[PDB]
Structures are given as structure tokens and as C-alpha cells.
């Protein structure tokens, strides 16, 4: 009658976009990058091991200076490390120990945390009193907090488990914008280098590219066969990679609006908990549940090196802003800092 013909129109529209995507692809990333020189094995040595956490680590974020990093664990502690000398600058005790995300502000003055409490607490590191105290507890999400990223010192975008992403105004605490369109729990988001857009991967095996200013999704990407666990932008901001629970990563191109390459191997059946890109966009690293952390060559989909020393599921993975290092965090309560040597 009405809803039936409306859904038929929607299906026809999605078929039209599918055939447009099919037509726009002359070839794939393989033949275009078949004659390029392979990266070769990437030997990475654990330089520092930031011991001190007493429970599984769920998230970490590198500071903008590529030296300070914040780490969140189910111990109920937010710790800021001096990755150069393995020093604990701060140890923020969280109100709720069920923390599944953390963030470092680009200015470095603020950090954020959240989790099963549905509240994104923001902490002011630089205070005249000399301690670190929570400045704003953002409430308004219904599901758990999965990821939170800082736009500026005043704007933070959070993705929750209630199929909604949101933009916040910290000084007021109200959601400036609310992003809707996902059907399953949203698990991660990655701000663009230009900061004007951000993508978001959800449990419905789809990733949606939004606009922080306009307020609604622009493009949607499908291809995965299970939950999308972590996502990350390409350094140039014109592509992103997703790490899903079906043991495959995928590289999507925003302008081409479709996937370009899949990073899968028959030896690994575990899901990718975290992904990260190298400073040049040449090495896509990916934390797996096999206790390992592969280092995929983005342009050729050939595994090159493994960060195998973790003993438990790798939950977080971050590459410095200058690319000097790669920290990886795991459920054994230890972060490890890696970088190749000649």
C-alpha cells in the first residue's frame, strides 16, 4: 500500500547506488599497486613497557606532542605516561571503573573518559591547584560510551552504544548535534585530519561518514560480515580503514564511496580490536584478539611484521603524530612502545 511501496523505492534506490559503485570501479587496489616495491618484514622492538595498570586496558590515546599518552583500564584509573622515560605524570581515579574509551585533547589541557556509565567525563589536567579534577560530565547518551574524540578544547564528539553519535559543547554540556542513522551499537569513530568530518563504525557491519557542522551522515559503507570494532582515518583524510570481528580489515575510499582492499589471512580467525595508520599511510597496523598485533602493508594487503609480545588480547593501538612510535595496550595491563630500527 504505502509502506510496502516506500520500502520498494528504498530498495530500488540502494540498488541504484550499488550499481553506481560497481560502475565507478575500473579496477582494484591490487593491479594499480602490483609493481610497487614491497615494504618487507618490519622488525619492531619493545622499547618501553609501561607497567603499572592492575586490570585490562581498554583504550589509549597519544598526546599531540607524541610523548605523553593517556591509558584507560578497568582498574578505574586514567594514567598519563611519559613515554620517553616511562613516568606516570598523572593517575586520575575514575568515578566508574567500567571505562571503555579515553582521549587526549589536541591542546593537551584536557582528557576524556567514558564507558558503561553513559557519561563522558572531562578532566582538566592543568589547574592552579596542582591536581587533576573532572571539569564536565557530559550526560545524554542512553547506551555505553564506545569512543570519544576532541574537536577542540571546547568540542568533543562521542559515539555510544545506542546507535547514536553526538557532538558536545563542553562549556555548556549540551549536545550541539546528535548523529543518527546507525542500527546497531556504535563501537568507534575517527576524526578527520581536517577535523571537518568523521566516520563511525557500528555493530551493524557498516561505517557512516558524518559532517560535524551539517549534522547528518553523508556516505555509508558496507562490506563487513560482522561487527566493526575499530576505525581510523587515512593520514590524508580521503580514506579510512575498519577492523571488524570477522577477522578482516577493509580500506574504504571516501571519494570512490566503496572499499578498495581487504586485509585477511587464513591463519587468523580472531577479530581486529584496534586499527591504526602509520604516519605516511603505508603501514596499517591492526590489533587482533590472538594476543598479537599485525602490521599490514596498506597498498598491497601483504602482512609485514607482527607485534607478537602481548600474552593477551590487544585492545588499543596508537601511532604517534610524528610516527616515531606505536604503542599497543592489552588485557594483561601492560602497554608497549615499538619502533623499527636499522
Amino acid at each position: 500500500s504505502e509502506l510496502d511501496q516506500l520500502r520498494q523505492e528504498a530498495e530500488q534506490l540502494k540498488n541504484q547506488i550499488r550499481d553506481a559503485r560497481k560502475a565507478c570501479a575500473d579496477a582494484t587496489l591490487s593491479q594499480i599497486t602490483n609493481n610497487i616495491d614491497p615494504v618487507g618484514r618490519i622488525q619492531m622492538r619493545t622499547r618501553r613497557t609501561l607497567r603499572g595498570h592492575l586490570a585490562k586496558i581498554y583504550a589509549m590515546h597519544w598526546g599531540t606532542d607524541s610523548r605523553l599518552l593517556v591509558s584507560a583500564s578497568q582498574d578505574g584509573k586514567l594514567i598519563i605516561w611519559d613515554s620517553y622515560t616511562t613516568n606516570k605524570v598523572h593517575a586520575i581515579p575514575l568515578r566508574s571503573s567500567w571505562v571503555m574509551t579515553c582521549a587526549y585533547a589536541p591542546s593537551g589541557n584536557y582528557v576524556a573518559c567514558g564507558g558503561l556509565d553513559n557519561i563522558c567525563s572531562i578532566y582538566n589536567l592543568k589547574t592552579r591547584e596542582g591536581n587533576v579534577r573532572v571539569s564536565r560530565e557530559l550526560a545524554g547518551h542512553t547506551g555505553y560510551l564506545s569512543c570519544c574524540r576532541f574537536l577542540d578544547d571546547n568540542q568533543i564528539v562521542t559515539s555510544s552504544g545506542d546507535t547514536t553519535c553526538a557532538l558536545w559543547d563542553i562549556e555548556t554540556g549540551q549536545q550541539t548535534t546528535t548523529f543518527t542513522g546507525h542500527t546497531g551499537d556504535v563501537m568507534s569513530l575517527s576524526l578527520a585530519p581536517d577535523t571537518r568530518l568523521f566516520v563511525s563504525g557500528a555493530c551493524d557491519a557498516s561505517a557512516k561518514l558524518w559532517d560535524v557542522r551539517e549534522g547528518m551522515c553523508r556516505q555509508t559503507f558496507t562490506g563487513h560480515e560482522s561487527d566493526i570494532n575499530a576505525i581510523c582515518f587515512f593520514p590524508n583524510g580521503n580514506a579510512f580503514a575498519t577492523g571488524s570481528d570477522d577477522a578482516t580489515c577493509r580500506l574504504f575510499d571516501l571519494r570512490a564511496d566503496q572499499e578498495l582492499m581487504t586485509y585477511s589471512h587464513d591463519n587468523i580467525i580472531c577479530g581486529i580490536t584496534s586499527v591504526s595508520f602509520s604516519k605516511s599511510g603505508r603501514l596499517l597496523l591492526a590489533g587482533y584478539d590472538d594476543f598479537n598485533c599485525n602490521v599490514w602493508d596498506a597498498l598491497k594487503a601483504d602482512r609485514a611484521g607482527v607485534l607478537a609480545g602481548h600474552d593477551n588480547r590487544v585492545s588499543c593501538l596508537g601511532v604517534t603524530d610524528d610516527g616515531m612510535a606505536v604503542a599497543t595496550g592489552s588485557w594483561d595491563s601492560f602497554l608497549k612502545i615499538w619502533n623499527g630500527s636499522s
Partner: single-chain antibody
Amino acid sequence: VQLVESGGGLVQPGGSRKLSCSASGFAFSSFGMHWVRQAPEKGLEWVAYISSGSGTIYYADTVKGRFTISRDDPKNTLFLQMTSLRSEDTAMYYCVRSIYYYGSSPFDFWGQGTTLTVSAADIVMTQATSSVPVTPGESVSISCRSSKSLLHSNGNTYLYWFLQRPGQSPQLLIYRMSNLASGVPDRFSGSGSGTAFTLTISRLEAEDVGVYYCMQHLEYPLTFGAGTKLEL
């Protein structure tokens, strides 16, 4: 943030006196606490230091073994017990706070000072000029020099700049030779070559007059410069 000290007064030579620095308005148990004296009509001079948790304690060579410094976290009060007080200990004693971590600003707050009047290897830090007649609206550079290079292996040049306005406690301007402290205008700027250092004020104000001190923090004991005075 407030640091108020008590216990100063007239003490006969060879006697004893007890100085207490009462901290209020900040997490006193997380801040290392120093004592800095200033003899009448002279420059600053470091006295003692106790870390957070009282783990580490240092004394100047002129005072080692004669004064003892202690802190009391529950009461938020810092102590300095004085014995064998001699005529050279008459000075204006300042209570200073400093927290040490990556990117911190040590020596950022100074107490009002307490006056004690007694009746009757180290890095040498040199300021060439003692008084600079200045007028508002121009640029002045304050020059300081060190006997030993302050640029450490890790890349930090541990030199601090303090401004003591007339009848007021010294104020931190620049920490680590380039970083401008909180609450200080951007007109102040510092640069150094590791042994030779300069502090430049872009545009003088009526509140920029005072004595400017250069201090090193490379190793203990901490040594101050003679001081450069700015007058209208």
C-alpha cells in the same frame, strides 16, 4: 593558592627560631616545597628543599646540618627549624612551591615572606648589569650568564626567570629558559645558547619595574644571579 609564613623576628646570635609556612588553596601534599631567603638590599639565595612525601631533602652548603626542614601533609604546613643562628642569617625567608613532572612549572608560587633579623663546585650565575633605566613603550633585554652550560642531555635548559616588584614576593616569569609561566603576559620572552641567556620585554608597563633574577635548576644547590633592577 596562598602561602603564609610565621615565626620571624629578632633573635639573639646563637639562638633558635622556628619558621612555619602554612599552605592553603592547593594540593600541598603533591608539591615540592623550597625555602628561599633574601638578605636586606641583596639578591635571592636558596636555603632548603623537601620533596613531595618528604622523600628527598637538600640543603645549601652554607646551611647544611644547621637548619632542618620538614613538612606536615595533614595540617598543610611546612616547617624550617633554625639552630645556631648567626648574624649572616638575617634575611627575608620565602616559602616556594614547585611540582616536578613533564611539562610542569616549578617555582611558580612564592609566599609573602617572613623577616628574620639576627642581632650582632656550585654553578656561578652572573648578571652583568645591576640597574637599567628604562621608559615604557620600548624593548629591554636582560642578560644573564652561567659558569656551566645548563643545556642537559635530554634537551631541557634548566634556567628560570623571576621578577621581584618593589615590596613584593618574586614572581616566576619564564621556566626552562623559554616557556612562559601562567598569568604572565606574552610581552616577556626568553632565549639562550646554553651558557648565555637573555630575557626580552617587548613593551614596558608601570608594573614591570623591579629586580629580575636568573636561576639555574640543573643541579643542587640552586644558585641565583645578582639581579638586574629596572627603574623609570
